[PDB]
Amino acid sequence: MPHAFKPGDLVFAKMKGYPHWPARIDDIADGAVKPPPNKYPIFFFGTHETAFLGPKDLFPYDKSKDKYGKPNKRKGFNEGLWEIQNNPHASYS
Numbered sequence: 001m002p003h004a005f006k007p008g009d010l011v012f013a014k015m016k017g018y019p020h021w022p023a024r025i026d027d028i029a030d031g032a033v034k035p036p037p038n039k040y041p042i043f044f045f046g047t048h049e050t051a052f053l054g055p056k057d058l059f060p061y062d063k064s065k066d067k068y069g070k071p072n073k074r075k076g077f078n079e080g081l082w083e084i085q086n087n088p089h090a091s092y093s
Contacts, residue, residue, distance in 0.1 A: 002060075005040055010061035010088050012068045013042045013053055020059060020068040021077070022084035026050065046080025048092050 005011075007027040012020035026041040028034055035041050039052040059068065061084065069085075071078050083092070 005055060005058060008089060010084055011042075012059045012061065012064050013044065013051075014057040014059070015051065015053070019072050019074065019077070020064070022046065022061070022069070022080040024084075024088060025058075043092070044076075044080065045083035045088070045092075046076035046078070048076075 005025050007025050009025045011023050011025065013023040014020050022045040023042050024045070026043045028041060035052040039054055040058070042051050042053045042058070043049075044051070061069075069081060071081070083090075
């Protein structure tokens with residue numbers, strides 16, 4: 001059975017106006033800006049952008065990849081697919 005989301009989990013993350021996007025739940029670095037309550041820091045692969053999202057917008061990667069893990073015209077997307085499949089836990093800083 002599912003646990004709560006934790007840093008390192010891989011997802012497709014949904015934001016208004018964008019396709020479900022390869023991403024991970026990030027850690028918060030010591031000294032870094034914390035998310036609002038009930039929100040997680042989401043790192044989007046390919047774009048390397050961070051947004052704060054709640055679970056309703058987070059789709060676990062294993063279950064979802066056969067639906068959402070297909071090339072997309074949008075900037076950074078296909079780079080994102082590579083990262084999530086090939087080195088999803090690397091430093092992209």
